[PDB]
Structures are given as C-alpha cells and as structure tokens.
Design a binder for this molecule. Structure first.
Ligand SMILES: CSC[C@H](NC(=O)[C@H](Cc1ccccc1)NC(=O)N1CCOCC1)C(=O)N[C@@H](CC1CCCCC1)[C@@H](O)C(=O)OC(C)C
Length: 330
C-alpha cells in the first residue's frame, strides 16, 4: 500500500509544516506536525484541560467506534525547545493520505504547555524517529511508520518540503518526478534513537568545500539549521552587516543583503541551500534587520539539519532493517 499527503507551512516564515491526519471512525481530521526528531503521535483531545485549549481541533475518543483505551498506559514528553505535554493512551485507526493503520497508539493529552495552547495551527504531533524514543510506559508503542511497514510497497517515506509553498510526504514509494539527478544514500546511526548521520563537509557561496565530519540529525520538526559554532561563524563572515545579537539570540543581518548559498556534503554529493532560504525574515514586522536561518548548535549539544536544509532537498527516510538517509537536489 502507499499514501501521499500535502504538507503546508503554518505561517509566512515556514516555522513548521502541518499535514492532515484522519483519526478514528468516522474520521476526525486533525492537522499534525510530522516530527522526525521524536516518536509519539499525540493530539489535543476532549481529555485536555479546558483552559489550555483554543484554536485547536481536538480528538474525541468517545465518538470514535474503533477507539480502545490502553489500560494503564500513560505518557510524558518534553521537546528541545522546552515544551511538553502528558496524558493517557488509546489505540484507534489512523490514516495519512489514504494509507490506513489499525491499532495505532494515539496519545491523548490531559495537559499541554503554554507554547502549544498559543499555537492555533498545530493540533498535535506525529512522531517518525525510531520507536525506542517513544514515551508511553510501561510498554512503549510503535510509530505510525513502524506499524505501516508490513503493508507498505517499500519501507520508506519521503519528505519534499516547500519554500514558502506546500510540499508532500509520501509513504511507501519514491516519486522520481519530484527531484533531479540521482539520490545519494548515507548510513544512519540509531544509537540515540534519531535519523542520525554524518555530513562529509561544507562550503560557503562560491568558495572551497572543506572535508570535515559533521554528525547531526535530520529533523523535520526543527525550523533552523543548527551547526558547529566555527562552521556558522565562517558563513556569516561572508555577510557584511551580519553580527551575533545576544538580545535576539542569534546572528542577525540587514534584510536588504543578498546572502550566499550554503553547500553541505552527503557522501560524494553536495546539496546547495539557496541564500534566500537562509533569510529567515524580519525580526519584527517592518524591521530592517532579519534573523538568519543558520545558527550555532553549541547550546543545543547536537547538530540539527532542520527545515532550512531539508526544504532545499528531496529526502528519503529508508526504514529497512538497516536504515539509511537519501538526499537528492530538486
Ligand atoms: C533546538 S530543537 C527545537 C525545536 N523547536 C523548533 O525548532 C520550533 C518549531 C516550532 C515551529 C512553529 C511553532 C512552534 C514550534 N521553532 C523554533 O524554536 N524557532 C525558534 C527560532 O526561530 C525559528 C523558529 C524542537 O524542539 N521540536 C520538537 C517537535 C514538536 C514540538 C511541539 C510543536 C510541534 C513540533 C522536536 O523536533 C524535537 O525536540 O527535536 C529534538 C530532538 C532536538
């Protein structure tokens, strides 16, 4: 079987992408943030404390004929930007883009932190890292992708994220119209539960490619590109009004500037980020300064190839028993 769904940016700065997911019978449609940096599918629901809900669309398990309570199972997660939620657990039918899994664990939030209530566009998360990071206890639950692997035509999914535009997640086949050239695959380590890989090096603008190993994660649920301090400082040295701003929390530059492209290595292949994709946008509406899309990972403690990078490429998460990651230009 296969599925394909449209993923849309939630705002004009592509802060995050949402995708329609049908949960329940009859189907309740919620727009979920597909996150390769965690492994919990959880939703706002009729369980969630009332003053912590607004904007969002909730799932109501009592109106789904196929929902079962998973007795005794509770979950609690927190993310890299400090947000968090917890609750209990049902199984129920979940479909993406025509592709249906029965028995999937749908985590019901009893409580959500303040950034989730304030974000009206995102109704939940669908996690697509490896199932060892799942948070349900006592027994951890498999992700949507792990549960669909049995019925998929191949055990892959692809992310094709658009630059101020919609894009596509596909499951189970590779759309050879959606990219150019050939895809290059590189090994993934699953040690930490992420789609973790090693970049072979980087270039700035039309300058030289430096071969140096950058271990990092491919994470659809992080906005920016976060790389080692000395790499990000070589980037912004080429932008004459860029400086590191403590107040703002990163490198800022005048919005009028034309930025250089950034190239990162995959194997022998090279992926080039256009400079326009690194201009994240004005620091406030009508400002002359804009925030940069490449920033340091030093306080994070891991390198993140977030949406700034993955949207310049067509990327294949290859979920075979030995996983790999594929990138092609587009
Ligand atoms: C340095 S890692 C930080 C990362 N968060 C992000 O990257 C959020 C994403 C967001 C977008 C729109 C609205 C709300 C949140 N953006 C963000 O912090 N930005 C700050 C700087 O300007 C760009 C936007 C991350 O924590 N996200 C979670 C996924 C989940 C969180 C809740 C909302 C739905 C997405 C996950 O990807 C994660 O923890 O990765 C870990 C492994 C580092």
């Amino acid at each position: 079987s296969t599925g394909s769904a449209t993923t849309t940016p939630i705002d004009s700065l592509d802060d995050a992408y949402i995708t329609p997911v049908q949960i329940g019978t009859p189907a309740q449609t919620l727009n979920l943030d597909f996150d390769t940096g965690s492994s919990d599918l959880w939703v706002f629901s009729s369980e969630t404390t009332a003053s912590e809900v607004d904007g969002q669309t909730i799932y109501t398990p009592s109106k789904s004929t196929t929902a079962k309570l998973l007795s005794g199972a509770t979950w609690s997660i927190s993310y890299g930007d400090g947000s968090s939620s917890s609750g209990d657990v049902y199984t129920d039918t979940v479909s993406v883009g025509g592709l249906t899994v029965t028995g999937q664990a749908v985590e019901s939030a009893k409580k959500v932190s303040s950034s989730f209530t304030e974000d009206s566009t995102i109704d939940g998360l669908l996690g697509l890292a490896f199932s060892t990071l799942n948070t349900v206890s006592p027994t951890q639950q498999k992700t949507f992708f792990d549960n669909a692997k049995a019925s998929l035509d191949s055990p892959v999914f692809t992310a094709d994220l658009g630059y101020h535009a919609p894009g596509t997640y596909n499951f189970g086949f590779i759309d050879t119209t959606a990219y150019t050239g050939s895809i290059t695959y590189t090994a993934v380590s699953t040690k930490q539960g992420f789609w973790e890989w090693t970049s072979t090096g980087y270039a700035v603008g039309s300058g030289t490619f430096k071969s140096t190993s950058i271990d990092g994660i491919a994470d659809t649920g992080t906005t920016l590109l976060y790389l080692p301090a000395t790499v990000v400082s070589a980037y912004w040295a080429q932008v004459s009004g860029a400086k590191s701003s403590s107040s703002v929390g990163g490198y800022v530059f005048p919005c009028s500037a034309t930025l250089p492209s950034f190239t990162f290595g995959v194997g022998s292949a090279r992926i080039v980020i256009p400079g326009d994709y690194i201009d994240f946008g004005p620091i406030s509406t009508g400002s002359s300064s804009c925030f940069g899309g490449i920033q340091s990972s030093a306080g994070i403690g891991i390198n993140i190839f977030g949406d700034v990078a993955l949207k310049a490429a067509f990327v294949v998460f290859n979920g075979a028993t030995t996983p790999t990651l594929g990138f092609a230009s587009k």
